[PDB]
Amino acid sequence: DPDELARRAAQVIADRTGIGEHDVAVVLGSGWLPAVAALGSPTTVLPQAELPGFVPPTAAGHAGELLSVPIGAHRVLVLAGRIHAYEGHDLRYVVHPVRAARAAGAQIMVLTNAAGGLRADLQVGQPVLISDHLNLTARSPLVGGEFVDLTDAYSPRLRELARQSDPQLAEGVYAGLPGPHYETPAEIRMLQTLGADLVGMSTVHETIAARAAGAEVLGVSLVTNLAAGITGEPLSHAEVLAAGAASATRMGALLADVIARF
Amino acid sequence: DPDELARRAAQVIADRTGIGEHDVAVVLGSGWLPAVAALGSPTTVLPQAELPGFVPPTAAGHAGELLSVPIGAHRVLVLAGRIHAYEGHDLRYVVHPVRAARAAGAQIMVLTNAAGGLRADLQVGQPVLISDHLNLTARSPLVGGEFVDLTDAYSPRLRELARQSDPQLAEGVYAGLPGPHYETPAEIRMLQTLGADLVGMSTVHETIAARAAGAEVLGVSLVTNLAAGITGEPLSHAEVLAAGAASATRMGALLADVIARF
Amino acid sequence: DPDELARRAAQVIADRTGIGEHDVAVVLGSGWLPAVAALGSPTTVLPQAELPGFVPPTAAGHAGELLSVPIGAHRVLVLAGRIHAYEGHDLRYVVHPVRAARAAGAQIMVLTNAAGGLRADLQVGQPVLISDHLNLTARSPLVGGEFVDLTDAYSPRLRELARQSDPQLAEGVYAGLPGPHYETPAEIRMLQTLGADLVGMSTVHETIAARAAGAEVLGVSLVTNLAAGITGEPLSHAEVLAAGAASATRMGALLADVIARF
Ligand SMILES: Nc1nc(=O)c2ncn([C@H]3C[C@H](O)[C@@H](CO)O3)c2[nH]1
Numbered sequence: 130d131p132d133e134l135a136r137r138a139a140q141v142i143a144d145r146t147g148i149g150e151h152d153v154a155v156v157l158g159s160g161w162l163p164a165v166a167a168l169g170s171p172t173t174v175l176p177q178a179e180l181p182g183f184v185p186p187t188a189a190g191h192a193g194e195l196l197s198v199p200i201g202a203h204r205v206l207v208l209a210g211r212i213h214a215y216e217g218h219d220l221r222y223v224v225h226p227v228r229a230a231r232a233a234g235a236q237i238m239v240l241t242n243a244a245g246g247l248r249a250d251l252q253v254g255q256p257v258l259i260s261d262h263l264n265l266t267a268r269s270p271l272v273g274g275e276f277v278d279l280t281d282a283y284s285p286r287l288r289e290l291a292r293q294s295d296p297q298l299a300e301g302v303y304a305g306l307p308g309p310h311y312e313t314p315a316e317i318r319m320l321q322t323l324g325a326d327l328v329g330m331s332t333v334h335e336t337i338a339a340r341a342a343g344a345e346v347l348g349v350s351l352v353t354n355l356a357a358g359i360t361g362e363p364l365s366h367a368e369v370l371a372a373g374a375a376s377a378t379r380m381g382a383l384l385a386d387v388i389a390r391f
Numbered sequence: 392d393p394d395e396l397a398r399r400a401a402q403v404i405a406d407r408t409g410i411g412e413h414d415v416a417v418v419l420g421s422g423w424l425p426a427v428a429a430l431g432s433p434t435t436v437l438p439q440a441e442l443p444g445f446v447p448p449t450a451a452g453h454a455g456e457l458l459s460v461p462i463g464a465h466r467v468l469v470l471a472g473r474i475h476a477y478e479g480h481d482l483r484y485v486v487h488p489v490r491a492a493r494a495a496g497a498q499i500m501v502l503t504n505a506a507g508g509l510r511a512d513l514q515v516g517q518p519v520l521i522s523d524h525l526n527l528t529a530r531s532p533l534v535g536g537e538f539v540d541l542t543d544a545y546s547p548r549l550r551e552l553a554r555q556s557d558p559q560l561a562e563g564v565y566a567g568l569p570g571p572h573y574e575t576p577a578e579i580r581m582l583q584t585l586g587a588d589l590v591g592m593s594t595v596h597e598t599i600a601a602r603a604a605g606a607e608v609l610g611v612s613l614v615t616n617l618a619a620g621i622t623g624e625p626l627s628h629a630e631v632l633a634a635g636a637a638s639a640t641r642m643g644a645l646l647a648d649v650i651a652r653f
Numbered sequence: 654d655p656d657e658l659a660r661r662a663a664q665v666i667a668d669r670t671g672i673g674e675h676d677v678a679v680v681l682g683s684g685w686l687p688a689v690a691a692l693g694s695p696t697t698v699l700p701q702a703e704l705p706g707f708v709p710p711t712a713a714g715h716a717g718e719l720l721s722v723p724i725g726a727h728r729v730l731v732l733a734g735r736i737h738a739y740e741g742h743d744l745r746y747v748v749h750p751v752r753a754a755r756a757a758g759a760q761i762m763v764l765t766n767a768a769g770g771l772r773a774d775l776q777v778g779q780p781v782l783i784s785d786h787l788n789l790t791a792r793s794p795l796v797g798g799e800f801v802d803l804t805d806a807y808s809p810r811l812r813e814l815a816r817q818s819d820p821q822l823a824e825g826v827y828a829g830l831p832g833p834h835y836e837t838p839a840e841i842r843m844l845q846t847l848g849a850d851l852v853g854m855s856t857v858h859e860t861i862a863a864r865a866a867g868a869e870v871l872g873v874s875l876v877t878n879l880a881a882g883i884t885g886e887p888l889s890h891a892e893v894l895a896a897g898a899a900s901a902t903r904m905g906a907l908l909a910d911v912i913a914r915f
């Protein structure tokens with residue numbers, strides 16, 4: 130039961146961190162791992178394998194960590210190593226950290242990702258608030274009659290707060306596609322016609338899970354590349370990571386500043 | 392085998408109803424349950440659990456009913472309680488009532504749903520004939536080489552007939568999305584660009600199954616809300632049901648009048 | 654493991670054909686089976702059931718063949734009988750022949766299909782190079798962190814080469830949908846707004862698999878019908894096959910000429 134394992138994850142967190150309430154959570158996207166040191170000093174580092182429900186039962190492999198990091202007046206659960214739908218596991222594992230985090234008291238999820246830039250003004254290394262998404266996975270992490278209203282899925286308030294920290298932060302619609310392949314240029318023209326400014330392979334489920342769980346969502350894309358076909362520059366995951374690395378100190382400091390304003 | 396269980400469901404129906412041919416079938420959408428009393432007097436009430444193939448093997452729970460209701464010169468199988476793709480069961484259970492109904496002689500499926508209104512003229516409580524759909528689930532209830540031509544999936548004739556009953560019935564394209572989450576406003580702008588007038592979480596599979604089974608389809612959406620972001624009014628399932636309730640007497644009477652014209 | 658069975662398929666091929674490297678592969682689409690005799694003389698005919706990984710474990714049935722055909726200075730693996738996603742088997746079986754073929758040395762995949770024509774100039778019996786695709790299946794045949802850049806998924810060079818053979822070959826964006834149902838006219842207007850010139854039920858996975866495997870892709874659609882609603886002419890699979898048959902000699906000769914230019 131996802132809610133059960135989430136509650137049980139949250140007991141482990143509170144137990145092992147000594148912290149009954151982590152007020153905020155962050156999921157670090159592709160390339161955002163080096164941003165951790167910029168976020169602050171982890172006080173607890175929890176192997177995700179030690180937390181109920183974080184690891185898909187099968188396809189074994191050394192999952193990442195959940196950090197408890199004091200950021201301003203918040204204990205923040207920071208997810209380092211996430212599961213993506215394209216790994217082929219149930220979405221419950223994709224969104225488990227949001228649910229676990231919510232069970233541990235997280236009222237804000239900061240959902241970060243690497244994204245391809247579609248909108249003309251967006252440039253590589255530029256962080257972009259997600260104002261909205263297009264879930265183009267044909268999936269939901271919610272599994273029977275759980276309506277969730279997705280109006281303001283990406284809290285305008287958290288965005289204003291984000292902008293108080295960085296007033297020039299652009300915002301954009303993010304299209305979540307399954308991946309793990311990147312888009313054809315024709316897909317990218319499609320996405321633009323669909324109203325996407327950003328394209329990625331995560332986030333949408335986590336946002337939906339977050340909202341269903343009663344949490345607010347700040348989405349932040351790091352534009353790591355302009356989306357396929359826009360310039361002709363070939364996309365690569367190693368370019369996405371390297372872009373995230375080159376931008377990671379700034380991204381961490383951005384998040385720390387923004388999260389402290391929450 | 393879906394066709395087998397459908398044939399076997401149809402034997403149960405004919406046996407328990409005493410009616411060899413139900414000429415029409417109705418699937419009642421979200422909120423349309425109170426419309427039953429408006430449809431007429433059920434002569435037989437069949438627990439869906441007593442009909443082969445209606446209940447997904449696992450995820451147990453007290454399924455609904457299939458009513459045999461005389462409506463005009465028709466015995467009409469009326470599905471009260473339906474299964475939605477978002478329940479996570481195979482689409483065969485989503486569309487089993489259409490197939491069962493077709494096996495019991497249904498030549499017309501009346502597929503009703505609650506939908507969010509996208510088109511400018513559509514208002515809450517307004518019934519809307521489905522002129523067509525966008526199946527945006529990336530799925531089909533058909534499972535190997537079963538081509539079905541979906542040209543006129545929503546019989547223009549049944550629509551004209553529907554309009555003979557209610558000449559001001561608008562019509563619209565319905566986008567079937569998986570749910571169970573409602574759309575982001577950005578998704579709703581996407582859908583509009585895609586040509587949808589209505590958005591929901593059912594119908595498309597049933598229509599496809601219906602057409603594959605050789606049956607005609609009248610789709611009717613009750614607009615229960617304007618789609619996300621159009622007004623800013625938050626979407627809720629309880630608003631969808633309450634809208635369906637407020638509109639249910641009319642909807643039942645509409646369907647009874649329309650079905651008798653068939 | 655798809656790569657393992659692919660390598661093992663390739664050993665079988667090299668063993669049974671006596672040919673260590675098949676430089677090219679062709680997947681024949683719906684209706685393209687009669688084009689085989691036009692392609693050349695098969696030197697080996699391999700039941701797909703005798704090749705590791707070609708047949709889905711369950712849903713048994715007499716799969717087709719993989720032909721080794723000398724075409725110009727190439728040994729070409731020609732897939733006769735393919736698996737489509739709509740058969741409900743894992744995509745690994747959909748794309749196994751591309752992977753097997755790549756393991757047997759194929760550097761070019763020629764991916765042929767029947768498609769519905771959306772673009773105004775496209776006519777029935779007209780072959781159309783795929784310049785790009787819209788993967789509208791919400792799926793990928795790649796299964797964990799396998800980025801594949803899909804920029805130039807359909808090699809412009811192979812297209813120019815194709816055009817050296819037939820300078821009037823049009824090109825078009827192909828939208829791969831799951832099927833097996835054909836589109837509603839509203840879906841077809843959607844697809845056009847999305848930038849599709851052609852619509853089908855295959856190819857996109859094979860292209861993605863091909864590219865992931867390091868192979869170049871020539872896509873060729875035979876326009877078998879104008880897409881749903883464009884003319885009103887009802888779509889049928891038997892029309893698709895008959896169109897493919899009427900056009901098969903030409904299509905085979907086209908492919909033979911084009912493949913020899915590779
Ligand atoms: N879909 C998609 N298109 C892009 O151009 C793109 N650029 C970066 N990313 C993100 C998403 C993943 O975190 C990770 C993909 O491995 O990087 C992208 N995703």
Ligand SMILES: Nc1nc(=O)c2ncn([C@H]3C[C@H](O)[C@@H](CO)O3)c2[nH]1
Pocket residue numbers: 276420421504505506507508568570572573574590591592593615616617618619626628631
């Ligand atoms: N997807 C979607 N968007 C809406 O705005 C909307 N409004 C009503 N409905 C319908 C569909 C289901 O029967 C049921 C959702 O629980 O109500 C909607 N479905």
Ligand SMILES: Nc1nc(=O)c2ncn([C@H]3C[C@H](O)[C@@H](CO)O3)c2[nH]1
Pocket residue numbers: 538682683766767768769770830832834835836852853854855877878879880881888890893
């Ligand atoms: N989706 C779709 N729409 C069409 O109008 C259409 N016309 C031909 N085809 C192709 C695809 C399959 O090979 C096969 C469908 O059985 O024929 C189509 N596919």
